[PDB]
Design a protein around this ligand. Structure first.
Ligand SMILES: Nc1ncnc2c1ncn2[C@@H]1O[C@H](COP(=O)(O)OP(=O)(O)NP(=O)(O)O)[C@@H](O)[C@H]1O
Ligand SMILES: Nc1ncnc2c1ncn2[C@@H]1O[C@H](COP(=O)(O)OP(=O)(O)NP(=O)(O)O)[C@@H](O)[C@H]1O
Ligand SMILES: [Mg+2]
Ligand SMILES: [Mg+2]
Ligand SMILES: [Mg+2]
Ligand SMILES: [Mg+2]
Lengths: 671, 672
């Protein structure tokens, strides 16, 4: 708290307290840790000569560099006070000392328009034509290399430019590391008057007119894009200029002029030799309702969409002309409409030339902010609809998403006739495990959905299932109890998908827990829905190991593997395994529910669960043998047989063995 | 080709050919399918009265609407020719007829600055204060509702604005559906002179100064952001103005003024009652090196997800930086992830998400290759997640999901996780992700060209992602280069299986033969073979036994050894014909001698055929854990590992014999 008192004293301009603290023995060369500012740096910055003299008196170091490598002398160029420069100069080894990005005191005087300081630094040996030397990482991307002239041109300091060219012998056509000259920088200055003056000065002294800036634009193109007739005239006076040069996108100055409704600029370019073959200029001028330009122009002369459902319209949208909204191409017409929304709608779009679905909100919409906020945090979530980005025009927030084919509701309806009635539903399993992963990672990211329902779940070309509608999402830290509403709706969605869309979601929403459970067609489904209604943060990832997600072959495999334990086969009643299994079921009296034929042959068995497992293992191993042709024909597919006959068996075994060493008999599962 | 000749004749202004074609019997009401343009619409648009009169003579319909619902009369407002308006008016039912977005002839005359047409339409009953009625989808996002005054203000037509307010009784404070008035529109006009004039006119007639535009900005804030002292003065003259109002981000006009180095504007706001408590204005003015403004002012929880990068990410979140679009970044060694060819990888925050930022020259061909490929790969789950890109004047910043480690670094960090001969599950997962990544990349029309361990990234969750696309190409150009990816993938298979012990450069200097010879097992050899000698080749190979777990391989052998024809040793069965058509240099020739002496005797209470080996594996499998067999169990150890180490070619041999037969059913469930 000695040098910290000094620092605040210098800021507040308290000179006597600075004297006292300096004589009490406080370090004048203290540099604060974050940005390396010293009291001297601060004194020069605040333009206070009394503190500068006082600090130097007590041995402040004028060679001291802050984090960006700037010294107090460099900073003095910024402030532009010649007296501070004079005072510091004797202690300065090199007047052209630079910071880590290449800035000298002279350059800073040019950037900040400090004329007196510029003159003083020139007279004391400043290199007027020094290029900024910078770090290796900057040089390798062609940054750095700018001069004082370029800076002064960019910032619109006409006086400085005049003086640099006339009194200080500045190189008019010097180039930075990207190949730009002062003329390019001059045309980036938004002030029209200063840009016009500086451009004339530069052109008069022989600035090269055929150079390139950003996007490989020429000075002529920059002048057209800025819609300035005078700058265009000025530039077209130079007879060496190349009027038909193209920017990186292949656009010529004429083409841009017609596109931007610049009639006079366009005529002037034609008269100075610009070619009509750069584009369909007539159609463009017509489109703009530039009647006179159309007459003048008349006188003087593969893409494939990925989406099947939306492909035809996507092709048409690619074909037509539209103005861009940042990276988005879109046209509000019924041909390109996907669906209604609360806020006017989902439309097809092209974003960075990728097909997308575009959800449109009012730019002030609270829900649009909820949607975009959640999507911005969910880009790593593979089971969430892929977010491309967003674009505002004046009024509408456009949220661009991966284009999907169908809603889960529509998808289930399209495929409702695929399966033979008691076929195993593999696709239900895949749909739901994606949703578990989606919702699980969404919660991990701190968000809750609030609206999980079949029309917010999207299926893509590859039959991938994605979670989609986040306009009502919330950060759950606010109200943790609302995470349970997601899990409940997920329970409903489990039944919805398992019933193949036959029972509407609204019907399911109007049922009690008990009724939902009673409406389930099997025990795996019942138990799973139970755990979602009574959870009750990796609950969802752990439930992927639940037997609802085990295939029928895997369930049958597990039963057989348990029925092969030596203690089951020897019927050792005091074994750990039979302990576990023997503690109101469909397999009570199981030997009577099996077919009469089958039971007799296998006997060449008691009503215990251990013996049922033993039975399943034995039948499993010997069912396909030639002697057992009749057995095989009666039972049919054995996994389906035992499950239909004993619906609670798989869940019962799972529950008894769940956290024992006999987990090893469960199938390999996701993790 | 009758009405198509007419259309071109009208465009070329060929009046006599139009007469002939009209009398040859061509429909004057033909509307081209795409945009619904008729010859009459086209005639009015090109400002040709002779064609307009001639077309109307032959029964052209002036009520005819094109795709956007505009009639020839509406278009006449755009062109602004009063004579065409006079000519069409008698046939027009309502002078205020509008298109689907609400535009009338009057409004169009205002938008396009057509003064004579504006006057004519006013005198013939135009509703000056009509709000644009538009479609339901537009209204529900609060678009539409603009007036002629707003349009004229927006487009900088001072004459029209003057005339609307003074001669035509325009409502100065009317509002569109978003709640904006003509004053907001006036301040969006980039021409300073016209903006200043129109603003004065509007303010003089009593435009409400406390309104909101985009981002909930006020007219005062718009004036500050546009850096115009005169517009600020003009607005601060109104004594009802609220100087301390905030935009959606909580910024006040003063705060913005200081941030943008607007000394005079800032002083003027302070004098007119703006409060200093809107932010730390002194620190901001200091930061900007606005010394005089500093003197004047003096007188008057976030958590990063990344463990490796978290500390530096916290620091970057804490400091002040200017934004490059959506990207916050600072080029300093503390935030540097790595060197590149061009500019390096630095930590960044993009839409407040932590990212790795790869920097290119804005003109870099490589940078265009990288961004092009990433733009097409957003659906590819096994490619590093692309957030977006941002250019400043010079540098293209490509923003990616921040990963922890390279595959090379990851393998080195975890080299001691596994016991001597443990099954390498993680190698399998790493490689199947890469197969899927590269497979979908090719499907998107792209080739990588540089697949190597330092271009593969592992994230916090141990997910593996493909990453460096500066040398990617569209392969349609040269399809043969797709093979270079598959070759490098073969190298990466060995690299990962050898756990990073053999460097990738070593592997790159070897021939196909040497790579194969350097593999530690038969599954790996066969897989690498199919990658060197190859469209989902790479999705089909996920079914290859390299990706089968040891339990699955053992399960398959047992399941084959349970076939009834194997157990009865029925030599003429289809199954035994597949596995052992008679004369072997396999490792399981004479297999009964290579098994332990003890084990063989007990199971005998067996021939040197493959069928009997399978039979043996099934029997041992079913009875190994029984109490009587305690010694057997202890000698064999884990049986899957036992048979595989004893008979290294057995799994591949069975796979190959049964590959496309009905006995595929014994293979494990696989990805698809
Ligand atoms: N990315 C997409 N790809 C294809 N269809 C989509 C996509 N996003 C949304 N949709 C469809 O458009 C509808 C838009 O609904 P949504 O995004 O849920 O907005 P919402 O305002 O919540 N709609 P509502 O369900 O009517 O309130 C969905 O039901 C889908 O049919
Ligand atoms: N998204 C990322 N997250 C974390 N580290 C990354 C990320 N992207 C790249 N890197 C790291 O930084 C290096 C950048 O290399 P890369 O993106 O391959 O550019 P490059 O020019 O090909 N590099 P070089 O291999 O030097 O040519 C990688 O090897 C990684 O170590
Ligand atoms: Mg919805
Ligand atoms: Mg919704
Ligand atoms: Mg690399
Ligand atoms: Mg590279």
């Amino acid at each position: 708290s000695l040098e910290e008192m000094l620092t605040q004293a210098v800021q507040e301009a308290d000179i006597e307290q600075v004297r006292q603290l300096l004589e009490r023995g406080a370090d004048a060369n203290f540099q604060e840790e974050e940005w390396g500012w010293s009291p001297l740096h601060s004194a020069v910055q605040m333009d206070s000569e009394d503190l500068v003299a006082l600090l130097l008196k007590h041995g402040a170091d004028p060679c001291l560099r802050k984090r960006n490598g700037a010294t107090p002398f460099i900073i003095a160029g910024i402030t532009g006070n010649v007296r501070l420069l004079q005072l510091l100069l004797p202690n300065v080894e090199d007047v052209n000392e630079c910071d880590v990005n290449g800035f000298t005191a002279f350059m800073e005087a040019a950037v900040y328009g400090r004329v007196e300081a510029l003159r003083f630094l020139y007279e004391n040996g400043a290199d007027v034509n020094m290029h900024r030397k910078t770090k290796q990482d900057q040089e390798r991307i062609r940054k750095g290399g700018a001069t004082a002239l370029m800076d002064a041109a960019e910032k619109g300091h006409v006086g400085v430019v005049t003086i640099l060219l006339h009194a200080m012998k500045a190189e008019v056509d010097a180039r930075d590391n990207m190949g730009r000259n002062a003329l390019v920088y001059a045309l980036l200055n938004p002030d029209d008057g200063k840009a016009k003056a500086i451009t004339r000065l530069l052109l008069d002294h022989g600035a090269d007119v055929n150079v390139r800036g950003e996007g490989s634009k020429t000075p002529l193109i920059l002048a057209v894009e800025r819609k300035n007739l005078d700058l265009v005239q000025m530039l077209l006076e130079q007879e060496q200029i190349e009027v038909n040069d193209t920017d990186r996108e292949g656009k010529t100055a004429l083409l841009l002029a017609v596109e931007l409704r610049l009639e006079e600029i366009a005529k002037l370019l034609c008269h100075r030799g610009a070619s009509t073959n750069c584009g369909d200029l007539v159609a463009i001028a017509r489109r703009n309702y530039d009647s006179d330009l159309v007459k003048f122009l008349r006188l003087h002369k593969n893409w494939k969409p990925q989406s099947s459902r939306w492909g035809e319209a996507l092709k048409h949208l690619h074909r037509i002309w539209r103005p861009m909204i940042g990276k988005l191409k879109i046209f509000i017409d019924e041909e390109y409409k996907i669906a209604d929304t609360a806020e006017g709608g989902i439309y097809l779009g092209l974003y960075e030339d990728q097909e997308v679905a575009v959800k449109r909100f009012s730019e002030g919409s609270t829900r649009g902010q909820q949607e975009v906020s959640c999507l911005q945090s969910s880009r790593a979530n593979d089971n969430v609809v892929t977010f491309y980005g967003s674009e505002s025009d004046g009024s509408c927030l456009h949220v661009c998403l991966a284009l999907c084919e169908y809603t889960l509701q529509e998808h289930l309806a399209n495929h409702r006739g695929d399966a033979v009635p008691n076929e195993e539903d593999e696709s239900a399993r895949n749909i739901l495990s994606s949703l578990f992963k989606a919702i699980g990672e969404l919660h991990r990211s701190g968000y809750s959905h609030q609206d999980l329902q079949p029309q917010n779940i999207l299926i893509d070309s590859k039959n991938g299932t994605f979670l989609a509608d986040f306009d009502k999402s919330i950060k759950w830290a606010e109200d943790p109890q609302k995470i349970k509403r997601d899990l409940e709706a997920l329970g409903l969605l489990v039944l919805y998908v398992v019933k193949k869309g036959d029972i509407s979601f609204e019907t399911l929403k109007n049922q009690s827990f008990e009724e939902v459970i009673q409406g389930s067609p099997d025990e795996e489904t019942r138990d799973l829905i139970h755990h979602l209604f009574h959870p009750g943060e990796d609950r969802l990832s752990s439930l992927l190991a639940h037997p609802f997600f085990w295939s029928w072959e895997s369930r049958y495999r597990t039963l057989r593997d348990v029925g092969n334990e030596s203690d089951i086969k020897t019927r050792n009643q005091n074994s750990r395994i039979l302990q576990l299994l023997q503690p109101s079921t469909s397999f009570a009296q199981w030997t009577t529910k099996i077919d009469s034929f089958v039971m007799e042959e296998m006997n060449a068995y008691q009503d215990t669960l251990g013996d049922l497992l033993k039975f399943i293992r034995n039948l499993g191993e010997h069912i396909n043998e030639q002697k057992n042709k009749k057995m095989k024909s009666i039972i049919g597919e054995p996994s389906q047989y035992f499950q239909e006959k004993f619906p609670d068996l798989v869940m019962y075994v799972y529950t008894k063995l769940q956290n024992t060493e006999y987990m090893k008999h469960f199938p390999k599962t996701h993790n």
